[PDB]
Amino acid sequence: GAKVTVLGLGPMGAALAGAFLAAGHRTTVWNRTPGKGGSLAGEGATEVASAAEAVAASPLVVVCLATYEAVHEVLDPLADELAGRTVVNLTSGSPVHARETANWAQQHGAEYLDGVIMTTPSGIGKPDYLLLYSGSQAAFDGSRGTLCALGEPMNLGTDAAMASVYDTALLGLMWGTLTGWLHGVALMGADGPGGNVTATAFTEVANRWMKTVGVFMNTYAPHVDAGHYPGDEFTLHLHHRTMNILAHASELRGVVSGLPELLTELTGRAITAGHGNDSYARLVEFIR
Amino acid sequence: HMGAKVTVLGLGPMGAALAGAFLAAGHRTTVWNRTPGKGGSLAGEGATEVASAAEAVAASPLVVVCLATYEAVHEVLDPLADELAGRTVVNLTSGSPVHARETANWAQQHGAEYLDGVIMTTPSGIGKPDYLLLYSGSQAAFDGSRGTLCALGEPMNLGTDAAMASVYDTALLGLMWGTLTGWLHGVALMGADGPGGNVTATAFTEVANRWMKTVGVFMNTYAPHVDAGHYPGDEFTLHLHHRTMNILAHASELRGVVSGLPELLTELTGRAITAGHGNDSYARLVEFIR
Ligand SMILES: NC(=O)c1ccc[n+]([C@@H]2O[C@H](COP(=O)([O-])OP(=O)(O)OC[C@H]3O[C@@H](n4cnc5c(N)ncnc54)[C@H](OP(=O)(O)O)[C@@H]3O)[C@@H](O)[C@H]2O)c1
Ligand SMILES: NC(=O)c1ccc[n+]([C@@H]2O[C@H](COP(=O)([O-])OP(=O)(O)OC[C@H]3O[C@@H](n4cnc5c(N)ncnc54)[C@H](OP(=O)(O)O)[C@@H]3O)[C@@H](O)[C@H]2O)c1
Ligand SMILES: [Cl-]
Ligand SMILES: [Cl-]
Ligand SMILES: [Cl-]
Ligand SMILES: [Cl-]
Ligand SMILES: [Cl-]
């Protein structure tokens, strides 16, 4: 039942407004171009003609525009009106622009939370999908109950630029996974003994296996932070040997992704450096 | 419910772990190893060690094999063709799909029920219900021995073709390495100097492990695309993948993260977009690696 304003009714901003309405919040919306708020008004939103009216309507102002340049074009004329309000900026952009906007919000007495949306418009308001936030802890703690309407909120910490970096790092993790998955699908689907398996059958097993892969990540993160990489029962020597088997199996079955060559070159450099007994986490030193 | 009689051939670190887990579950376990003197601890845990593989095979209706190579499997099993008739052989040696099939065919010629398997953990993970063992081959063997095999870990029946487990192992390891390398790349990006950086690997990984639920949703969404040969892009097209991969490439260069992953990703999506599939899903890329 809290008052919340959304600035920006593009596909994503309209979805945020819709999710706020579905949670029962008193939702005021504004967009630069008229005529994009009729469906939302039918669901109980109040559309207003100016950003100044929209900002004045709610103590919590959620911004979702195309660029950070657009954020300041809209909000800098309203600097005096933002004192004491909370600004949650879900616009995507660079870490430096997040930091510059946080500094600007601080200068004007607005509590500033920068965020990133880890889904597409249709995922907003649904379970499991993440929104990541960084900046004012008071803003996060005071707004979390309302922000929950959009998806699962995570507070990354106090530095407003964190969300931008996390988004890029998490997409890289997603692409590494999805590419290893595509490689596996193509291996399973290929003609050959034990092949001609569908992607759906493979993925049913893969989804179980990903539980084990997640434990590996949880085991290896403290190795990176300690700078100590004990290899235990799965050393880089064994990674490299088995990667060579993957390379050979892939070549036989006609799967050409670049992944095996990337993996063997990287592990090979760490082994040449004498770290063959270490965990996969030692490889962070060979990409950084 | 009722304890079984099982034989393990092979007392290397994995084979000895398998035998220990059968014992822990209450099974009457007979063990043999080519080299004597590796079954000491197992005997005190209740195993019966015998001197020859022939004695070991004759001791149990279920014969679990875990040797260094399929060459070794052949050297041990070939003189025992007659002795295997009517027994179930579960071969957890790692090896090639063709070697699994050839062993399967030999076992069938001699009247043994043959199940080939792969162990998706290391010796210390055996005997825990959270790690996977994948099996393929005789469904009669799997159904009849599943209760016993549960002692080792969670068993999964991949199907009737004995060679499948070998292929799944390699494919799942590739998936693991793609994930772990994307994770390493992300750890490096988060740890680097810069606004929003100097974040610990542990902090990053706390968020990453929540995010992996979403990544799994993508794999479950995209598998039917591959099987149908139809790749609707919907709200995440290859155009958008390519655009955001370029951001990743730029961010990584600025922070000195050099993993080769951004170049692999941009080149692959680039080929599909040049081919005219920019509006399709990530699943369309299967056609550009096979
Ligand atoms: N859609 C996604 O998949 C997704 C996922 C995660 C994050 N995001 C982020 O969410 C934000 C919104 O994306 P989107 O889907 O809504 O489409 P968008 O094209 O990125 O942004 C459209 C919105 O920005 C407004 N805008 C652009 N320039 C403006 C300016 N100079 N002054 C005032 N308003 C301006 C548009 O107003 P008009 O209607 O008047 O043109 C519209 O409301 C982006 O930063 C995007 O990167 C999107
Ligand atoms: N360890 C793991 O992390 C892991 C994970 C998944 C799968 N696996 C698979 O498990 C199997 C065994 O691995 P392991 O850890 O036990 O060590 P291993 O070195 O791969 O195999 C050692 C065992 O093989 C026996 N062996 C080797 N050559 C033989 C021959 N010509 N004739 C008879 N026996 C022979 C050795 O007997 P002796 O003692 O007399 O030399 C010993 O019992 C391998 O196929 C491995 O790939 C292992
Ligand atoms: Cl309120
Ligand atoms: Cl107010
Ligand atoms: Cl395929
Ligand atoms: Cl018997
Ligand atoms: Cl061999």
Numbering used by the authors:
A (entry chain A): 2 to 289
B (entry chain B): 0 to 289
Sentences from the paper on this structure:
RedE, an IRED, serves as a biosynthetic enzyme in the formation of the indolocarbazole natural product reductasporine. RedE resembles the canonical IRED fold with an N-terminal NADPH-binding Rossmann domain and a C-terminal helical bundle mediating homodimerization. Here, we present crystal structures of RedE, including apo, NADP+-bound and two ternary complexes with AFA and NADP(H). These crystal structures reveal an unexpected secondary indolocarbazole binding site adjoined to the primary active site, and site-directed mutagenesis shows both are critical for catalysis.
Datasets from crystals of RedE grown with 10 mM NADP+ produce Fo–Fc electron density omit maps that can be unambiguously modelled as NADP+. The cofactor binds a broad cleft formed from the confluence of α1, α2, and β1-5 with the characteristic GxGxxG NADPH binding sequence found at the center between β1 and α1 (9-GLGPMG-14) with hydrogen bonds forming between the C5ʹ-phosphate and M13 amide N-H and an ordered water held between the amide nitrogen atoms of G11 and G14 and C65 amide carbonyl. The adenosine C2ʹ-phosphate is held in place by a salt bridge with R33 alongside hydrogen bonds with Q32, T34, and K37. The adenine ring rests against the A71 side chain and is parallel stacked with the R33 guanidino group. E74 hydrogen bonds to the adenine C6-amine. The backbone N-H of A67 hydrogen bonds with the adenosine furan oxygen, while the S83 side chain and L66 backbone carbonyl and interact with the C2ʹ- and C3ʹ-hydroxyl of the nicotinamide riboside, respectively. The re-face of the nicotinamide C4 is positioned overtop the side chain of M13 with the si-face facing into a deep pocket formed at the dimer interface of the C-terminal helical bundle. Comparison of the apo and binary structures show that R33 moves out of the adenine binding area in order to stack against the purine ring while forming a salt bridge to the nearby 2ʹ-phosphate.
